[PDB]
Amino acid sequence: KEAIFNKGTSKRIWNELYKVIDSSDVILHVLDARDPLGTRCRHVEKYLAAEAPHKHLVFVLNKIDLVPSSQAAAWIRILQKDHPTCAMRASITNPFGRGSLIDLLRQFSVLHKDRKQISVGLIGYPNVGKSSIINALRGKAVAKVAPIPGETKVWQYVTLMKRIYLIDCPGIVPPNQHDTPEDLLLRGVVRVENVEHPEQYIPAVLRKVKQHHMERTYELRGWKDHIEFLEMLARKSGRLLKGGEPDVDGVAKQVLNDFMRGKIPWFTPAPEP
Amino acid sequence: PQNEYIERHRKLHGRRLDAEERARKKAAREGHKNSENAQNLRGLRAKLYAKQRHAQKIQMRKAIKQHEERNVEPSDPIPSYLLDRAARFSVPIPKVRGISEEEMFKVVKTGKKTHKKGWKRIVTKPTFVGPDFTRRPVKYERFIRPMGLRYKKANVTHPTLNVTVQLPILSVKKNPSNPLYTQLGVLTKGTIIEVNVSDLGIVTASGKIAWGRYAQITNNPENDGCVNAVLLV
Amino acid sequence: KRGAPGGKLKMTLGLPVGAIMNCADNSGARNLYIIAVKGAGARLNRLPAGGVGDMVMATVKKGKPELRKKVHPAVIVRQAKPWKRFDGVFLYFEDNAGVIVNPKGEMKGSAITGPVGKEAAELWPRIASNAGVVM
Amino acid sequence: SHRKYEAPRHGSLAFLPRKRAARHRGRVKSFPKDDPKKPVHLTAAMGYKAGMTTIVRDLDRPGAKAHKKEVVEAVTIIDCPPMVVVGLVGYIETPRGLRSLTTVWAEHLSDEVKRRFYKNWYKSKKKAFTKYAKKYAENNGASITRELERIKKYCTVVRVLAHTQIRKTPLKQKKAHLMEIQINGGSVADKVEFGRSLFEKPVTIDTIFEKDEMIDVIAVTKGHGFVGVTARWGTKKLPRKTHKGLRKVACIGAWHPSHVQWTVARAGQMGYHHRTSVNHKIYRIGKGDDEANASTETDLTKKKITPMGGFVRYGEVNNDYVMIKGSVPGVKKRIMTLRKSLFTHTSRKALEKVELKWIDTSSEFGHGAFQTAAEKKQFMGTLKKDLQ
Amino acid sequence: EEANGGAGVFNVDLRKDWILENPEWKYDKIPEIFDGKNVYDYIDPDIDAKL
Amino acid sequence: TQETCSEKFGAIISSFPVLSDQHPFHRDLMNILYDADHFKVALGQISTAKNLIETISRDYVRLLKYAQSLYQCKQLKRAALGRMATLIKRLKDPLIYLDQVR
Amino acid sequence: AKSARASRIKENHQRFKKNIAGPVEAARLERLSAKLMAIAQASGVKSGKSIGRKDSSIVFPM
RNA sequence: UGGAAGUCGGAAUCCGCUAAGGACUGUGUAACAACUCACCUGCCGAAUGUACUAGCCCUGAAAAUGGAUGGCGCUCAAGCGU
RNA sequence: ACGAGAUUCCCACUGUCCCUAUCUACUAUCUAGCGAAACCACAGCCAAGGGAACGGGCUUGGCAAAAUCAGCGGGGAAAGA
RNA sequence: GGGAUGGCUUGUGGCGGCCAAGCGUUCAUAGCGACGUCGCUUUGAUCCUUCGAUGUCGGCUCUUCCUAUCAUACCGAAGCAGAAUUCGGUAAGCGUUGGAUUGUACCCACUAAUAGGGAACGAGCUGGGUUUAGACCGUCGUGAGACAGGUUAGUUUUACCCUACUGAUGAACUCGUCGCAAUGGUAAUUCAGCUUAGUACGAGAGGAACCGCUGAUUCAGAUAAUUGGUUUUUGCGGUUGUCCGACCGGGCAGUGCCGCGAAGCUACCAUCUGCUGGAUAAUGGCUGAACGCCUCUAAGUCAGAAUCCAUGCCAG
């Protein structure tokens, strides 16, 4: 197994995580709306429930513009059965849920008014939108944001108010014996250029995404499998190597980057009650 | 092969023709071999051999004493209900070694220039940070109490019951070296701590459960990796 | 046995670690990237290398997806580097090619395309039985 | 701290110093030990390295891969004109070692061996051994008899003085090569009588060595001049644009003592070293009188060992020659010392019998594919100059 | 081979089971090269009539 | 020290047969020869000692990160090794039992 | 692997030298000695029978 | 206890004949058997055994260029005590 | 869109490397002529001891033979250090 | 202007209570205490508890040393049947690799094995700690600016001196030829296959070893018959532009470019070669006292490791 799939489990990253947890009063656990139970860190939830029960855990479901609204509301219901949750679209220009999140942090500040200030630390997987949420709450691009994972490598304080501080954290991946490299890559842990043999994960993308969405997005139809789909896309887009050979690897990398960056619409449906 | 096959081979064929004689000769040379090992082994092997032979000699002479005597208390008389029983309200360790402020705190240098700023002090001894503790923001924390040096329980022993229970710590009452060390909650030798004594079944004269009691640290946690305490009963 | 062919005379090793050679059999693979050579000694900075008849550890870079996740034992049957035999003959093939086998030497495939080397055919009896041309 | 990745030494400490040899002719450091119940025999000889060629050998090596098959092997040709014995040296045993006691020379010495005692033979009066030749005449060789009886009475090691017949070689050198060859076997009186009977007589290579025997070759290697560490010791080249040179050793020292050690590779002389290589099999002792001495019992072409156009930078071999399997230290035109093996051999290869089937006589001045001029003329046909 | 040295020492005689017209031709050295040509190329049973 | 202890404990655990994966004849034959409760308790105590050794080593390495002198480092190392030796000494009976089983 | 300077390897080599290569070297040496013998054969003071004197130091000069 | 006879285990460990012999010190058997030890007697022939104390000597922990009672060298000392 | 801005990857490509080899010119080399500078307490082989964990001079040993040439970077020396 | 702990250390925890050989102690009968022991620190689970860089390490080339031995050699013990081993002993002679990962030390494979350190860490080169001057973001400050920090780009540049080392000459003894060997160095290493033998051993599955034979890994020393490489052989031929009016024969494009190319040099990219006596350590013994048994040791003595010393080998 490649070390690129072992990325996100480093001792430095988890020392950063526990530093943010020890410094923070309110833990904003950021979830991806396309996979909320997939991006949920029950490892950190167990640690917070066992060792530091005084800290308040709040779910923030980001990227709700990539999922249908009814599915997003169902996910909010499922998560609000457990913890106080908010809906969020982390954009500097056009945010959603920013006022509700500000009001929730104001309530927690009213609870901890005896202390001089409170610290709110943001945790979650890579590329869920932690730094983007910080930027949306601040109103200014104060944290570096990029669609590739692992831009935030250290912890950073950003003052939202004179009594509220915001802490950014590097993206963490809890270790699990049931997690696969395909699941990690589809959740967005890894970078697509560094992984080997990219086209093995294309059938997983074709399973998670409806066929008509692929046909509308890439303006191609009639493929019988992922290999023929990548070959047709390569011949259409001109991704040809020396000797007229299609660049299936580069086309698969393009499709994977589109899938994690949300140019291809997909979501996980909520469980039925 | 299956089952006791070497024993069956010894039954059906025996052993080597010199086996008993060589065993007897080796047992006879054992004394010379032991003396040669005692006079010619060197280093850690020699030290371990000498300690092990000392243990064997002690066990052997105890065996001789027992076989020789196979065929054979307080000063003042007290009744059976007063046996095993024992003003100045002194603690078990009334005086310890004082700790200087370099031995307590080291200087954490911060900045980016060649000349750093050294206002941050890190506590080197173990501490009890208290209940519901959240670390101060980094721009305002002076006294760093690291996570790996935080202790929440202590091995507290009852002087009368002669049993040791692992009890939670409630607060640090007095660190004898400095009141600042008490305020920081530093666990050193001779420090009075408050422990939860709910597991010892201590009760008052009417039935109220006593769940807080003073104990004193009797070890060096920074050298031993554990907090050991004696109840002040 | 660690898969080191015994009785092989010294020949020029033309395929080091990192070489991609053709797959001469019908097992579904079409190329083999060499990651190790069986029987390679210890030397500072020296890459392990293999010749015709040498057993190597390879991975498949093009072929059936089932063979792409495992490390296969291979036997090199053709090399492009010229080498000398005991009769003074210097020879080479037009391409570097090998076949996928089990550690005991039996092939995964059922037929071999193109000729095989004399050294490979002599050292591995299944290659001789599954070869059509021996050179 | 310690070296992180273990690696052996570059080069051997057993061949230090890497300096030029003290003299051109190879020195026999050790002779085979003497068994007095053996017959008397000579243990060394000299020749001149002509070059190399190719053979095909019908191999009979049971248990080998090429058993009952044909193998192509490289061989080295040494021209061996007959050697003349002109002296007898006696050695005694002392607590300080072997000591030369007396030396008896022959009555008549050739100008070849006389040239060795002069640096300017052309300006000399050639007076060497002139007064010594008169002691064979005065008092019926009484002094010669006294020295021979002294060797018979007091000595334990007897060596003959033998010189090469260099006029029979294509070399432009007229100055011969002289060496002491130990007589092994017999008693001391037998050795003295053996030398006395061998004075002024030519000794051929076939009476000292015999086919399918492994011998030792003693010589001085090819000189290379002042050579840096990379080719002198096989050290790793430093990366491209390394400051102050990349064909160097980066650290000649990082540790105490405050010195450069004798074990550190340094630039200097490479080649021209005295080397004794052992276990070389004699494949054929060919005769100069034979006009088909490079013809086997399978190849019936009547041809000599000389290639077409001769050996490159040597000439033609017209005397008795030795064919040696493999390569030997030295260059062409160089004096070669062939010595008996010091111990009884422990390999079946020394007990093998060599059966040659073909010897390459093609030109080494190019890509020659004919073995004689007649074959080339038969292949080409008639040319313009033949009609002209 | 076990009476005469063992495996790897005994030298087998490959001309012992040859069937020839005359038995003493068994251990003859068959020529192959003569004046830069191949004898086995010129071997022909009708060579007398051809000459 | 903890790597040596963990390697030997894992060699003990991973080589002994696991009854939950055996054929019912083999499992019940091992139950007839051996009290299966005793077998599982012995191997579980081996695994528990292995994990306790790992936890003790992790805690003492974390303390050695903050130790400030060679004397304190030496005392911490001796403390960790003594706790490991105490854990191994508390396994006197299962080790003899498992060797007889082997 | 057994070393070149190993006692059992030395004993094996000695037995080989005594039993196998020895007769071959003896026969070759006898033939060569015969061939060289072929080429070789093909008052006391005034006669040299009494070996007289030829025509720092070990002791202190005194 | 399937079997357990002193010798797989648990608990007791007595009496008689005694010169003396354990409800047994080990080997051994499936269990027995058999051998052996503790103990006693016969032969012998005069001094021993145990535990400590004080001397000298060995071990009682050592790394990393080649080296140090100052060096040679010293053994009824050229070492140690007077 | 644009960029001598920072980063990752793919194809091609090759002495970057396996693992080095060879050739050319100009040096370096030698000669005729011409001809400085930096630096310099005195000098330059090591080992052990020289309480101020310093030794090239001291002590105790190893030892030790004129005059030189080409390289060399361990030590000394050498960084407008 | 002033500066830049050390005959330390190693394999076995702390606290508290019992027990006890002993040390002390008889006008006081207390107190220490070896060897031990007892309490605190999951039915082979869990994988839903990774807990703070102020202190900096890496890497290339190369040499040597230590043993605290991973492998190879020998030996002792273990249900060690065989095979594979495990524990321990003597031993540093000989080896101990190739890679991936910087969102920042562990994995994978080959192999006999991938042992641990020192000579730095009490002015060689090159990546981080790491930090002159430019610039941006984050925190703090009214501010200049500072930092909990994060990012980018960024000037030290000997050798000809002495010594050491590597090589090369050399006066004096007339010149030269052939030698001896004090001393210094020293070299080989590991694996596989055939036979033994599908044999010993084994219920079966499986499955050795000595003698003998043949190769290969790493290392070392040479060599160029052959095969590749190299081309100022400017050797021959082809070809672009220009010039000598054209052809021929040539110049220039610093070797115009291309093809082949002897010779020379070269490459595990080619080929050849690498050798034997004595004394030992751990152990296994013989005879035999100490000590009327006994004992490999005391006197005497046999064997035995890749160890030690020499020969072979290089210098002289």
Ligand SMILES: Nc1nc2c(ncn2[C@@H]2O[C@H](COP(=O)(O)OP(=O)(O)OP(=O)(O)O)[C@@H](O)[C@H]2O)c(=O)[nH]1
């Ligand atoms: N459509 C959509 N995209 C979003 C939203 N929030 C974030 N993104 C995208 O997700 C990417 C992740 O942004 P980050 O701020 O770096 O999130 P992160 O989890 O902190 O990423 P790391 O730096 O790896 O830790 C960004 O590049 C955005 O383009 C959202 O609300 N809607």
Ligand SMILES: [Mg+2]
């Ligand atoms: Mg991101």
Ligand SMILES: [Mg+2]
């Ligand atoms: Mg981020």
